[PDB]
Amino acid sequence: IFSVDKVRADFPVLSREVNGLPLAYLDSAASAQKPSQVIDAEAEFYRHGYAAVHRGIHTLSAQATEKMENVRKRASLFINARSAEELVFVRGTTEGINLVANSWGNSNVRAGDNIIISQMEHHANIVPWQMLCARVGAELRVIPLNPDGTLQLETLPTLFDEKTRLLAITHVSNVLGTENPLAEMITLAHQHGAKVLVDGAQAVMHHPVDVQALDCDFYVFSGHKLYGPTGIGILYVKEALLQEMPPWEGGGSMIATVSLSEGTTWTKAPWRFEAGTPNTGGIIGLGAALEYVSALGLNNIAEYEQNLMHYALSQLESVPDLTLYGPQNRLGVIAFNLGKHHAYDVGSFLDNYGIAVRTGHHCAMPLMAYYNVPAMCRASLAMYNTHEEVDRLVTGLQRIHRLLG
Amino acid sequence: IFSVDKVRADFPVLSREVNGLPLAYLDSAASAQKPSQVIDAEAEFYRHGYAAVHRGIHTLSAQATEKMENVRKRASLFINARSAEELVFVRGTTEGINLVANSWGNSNVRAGDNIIISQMEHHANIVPWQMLCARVGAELRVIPLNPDGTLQLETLPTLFDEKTRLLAITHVSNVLGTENPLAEMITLAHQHGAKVLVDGAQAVMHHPVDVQALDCDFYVFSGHKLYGPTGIGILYVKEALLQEMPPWEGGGSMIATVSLSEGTTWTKAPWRFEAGTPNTGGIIGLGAALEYVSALGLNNIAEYEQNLMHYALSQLESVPDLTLYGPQNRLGVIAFNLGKHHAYDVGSFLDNYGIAVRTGHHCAMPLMAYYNVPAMCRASLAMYNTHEEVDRLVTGLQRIHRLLG
């Protein structure tokens, strides 16, 4: 099982000091810190086996190509996709959603159709669908929230109809920490012939994820939140849908033939969706990140994190005038407001105490609006965070209270 | 000035051995090796200042945001853009071309219009325009080649007309090493009201590049060819055009406001075109790469490389039955065929001698077709390559000749 202290000693940024104080990094929901195994796997790859990966003859290139197709496989196993060919390497969740929206969206959603998202979505699971609806004349319908941060599921009967082509929904909210009941919802959507895109940017680091049990048609996530590098993410599409999708970006490596007088032909899935040099260094790093989480055990992480969350919720009970947002069973993040202070001031005092939290709309304006607040403060409690970091948060909020109140 | 030996000692992969032999990496045109200053700038950033960059309050995040906006500025200075706000961070040249093609292309090229590319383009400067022409009903016209690997400029009068909305052309060919006369061509295009997109993936590492003197409207290049990481590239657009372009990817950070009942508004250029977490690690690395080239001096590099090229061309003169393709003044790469052996066999023998060259169509099928060959072999002679690596190439080709002939 889990030793938080052994885990923290893998993360070099956690030794840092900030504003002369010891960093309490509580913003892993925005981007996670990377263990040195991740950092060094990327660096070693650049120091020793670097080459172009376009299935080259020469050795380094042939080896780099295989290391990359191994990360594809490993990622596919990590989410239990049926095969490696169902995963497309993207820049991150956001790019993965725009690829679906354009490639699948353009040939499957028509004027008069509708698409459903929820009021808790992140802007990455909003904007691309908004753009698709404008382009084709479809309607974007929304599942409303309940006060407690959970979706009003009683509204589906009225949102799902025979024009519903897609449900795009978050696994886990980045502000509320709510986990949506994806499997039952996917069951429902599928009964109307609607596909489901699952945004799992805040799910893959907290517990095991199984796309076959989910039965989601599309699943997306980013590496930088899952202790990996930036610039790399994964888009999973069911083989049967991926095989009919037309290309989105065009260029090198995604074509089979290119003619200036007979036109161009495409290569097969997944490679049809990856144009030009891939972020090979980010792919190697992402494989390291996946091996590092799998070796900790998602179920040991989940367990440590859950207990940390319970500890935090319980101590925050003694911060006066604290508003929490979201369900009690929240995963990963704690979204809150302190009395009437603007979150911006609350996060500047916390920052000034060496405590990193995220403050603002969190790329979720419609969720702020639902709560009728312009912004919120948010703490992430990841696998490398401690009781002591929690205590500093509580104390800092109490002091912010005393001083500004 | 330039010490090739001092330069090589910065590149860790050049000490490697391959197939038990000392690597002679002659494939920098496909992707370049990275100096340890580049590798370590990325790694240090992850070990010590890592955070989300979405203009966060907390310290690390505020610092990461500034490091990134400094790389934007530095890149803008490296190509002499008038300002930092004319550069968009992309995955690489390919993504930069698809962004222009969609964002600018969709609102500016209509049914009946035409777009001009050349017969030497790379697939990245082909495919996106092919897709745009299919979507809107425009015609893709091509500047033909001369035998020597130079464009037939006498054909422009017949290709440019009042329906020509764009010229997309390479700076430097990745197979022939030809440098197109961009400034005069841009002058011409502009006289018809056509914009010009310059593909400079093979220009930025060989000599200084100045987008104001060029007067190109769009310029693209990738970091992995310019001694930098993967997953990061630059798209330069003239401020006046960039300011009217609508967004391409949607999501976090590129919006000003997001409403589920009043619609969404956009932020300003460049940030309107960057959705979701950026490849922050690749950006830091790209800044290191830019500082490392600028400190060598593009003009010292150009000079060393040119002399290396002259040395190579002269020794290859004693390889029997060698076909070279491209002009004598070629930059960077040497494209060739050995007698009647398929390039694939030539590159496997070379590989087996520890010599990495690229063999195939090089993501330029129309250029192979022009030469009526399915493929070619290609050597890159970059700033870290030596006379001795050239000699091994020549010797290996002579032996391949003797054995297979």
Q: What attributes characterize this protein structure?
A:
homodimer; alpha/beta; Aspartate Aminotransferase, domain 1; 2 domains; seven-stranded mixed sheet; four-stranded antiparallel sheet; 14 helices; Aminotrans_V_dom (chains A, B); cysteine sulfinate desulfinase activity (chains A, B)
Report a brief summary of the structure:
Two copies of one chain form a homodimer. The first copy, chain A, has 405 residues and is of the alpha/beta class. Chain A is built from 14 helices and 17 strands.
Describe the structure.
2 copies of one chain form a homodimer. Chain A is built from 14 helices and 17 strands. Chain A is globular, with a radius of gyration of 22 Å. The first copy, chain A, folds into 2 domains: 2-36 and 297-400, Aspartate Aminotransferase, domain 1, CATH 3.90.1150; 37-296, Type I PLP-dependent aspartate aminotransferase-like (Major domain) (Aspartate Aminotransferase, domain 2). The first copy, chain A, has 405 residues and is α/β, with parallel strands linked by helices. In chain A, helix 2 (36-48) packs antiparallel against helix 10 (280-296) and helix 4 runs parallel beside helix 5. Chain A has helices at 4-8, 36-48, 59-78, 93-106, 127-136, 156-159, 182-191, 211-214, 239-244, 280-296, 298-316, 343-352, 365-371, 387-404, and strands at 17-18, 21-22, 24-25, 87-90, 114-118, 139-143, 164-170, 195-199, 218-222, 233-237, 255-258, 264-266, 322-325, 333-338, 355-356, 358-360, 376-380. The relative contact order of chain A is 0.16. Chains A and B meet through helix 2, helix 3, helix 4, helix 5 and strand 11 of A and helix 2, helix 3, helix 4, helix 5 and strand 11 of B.
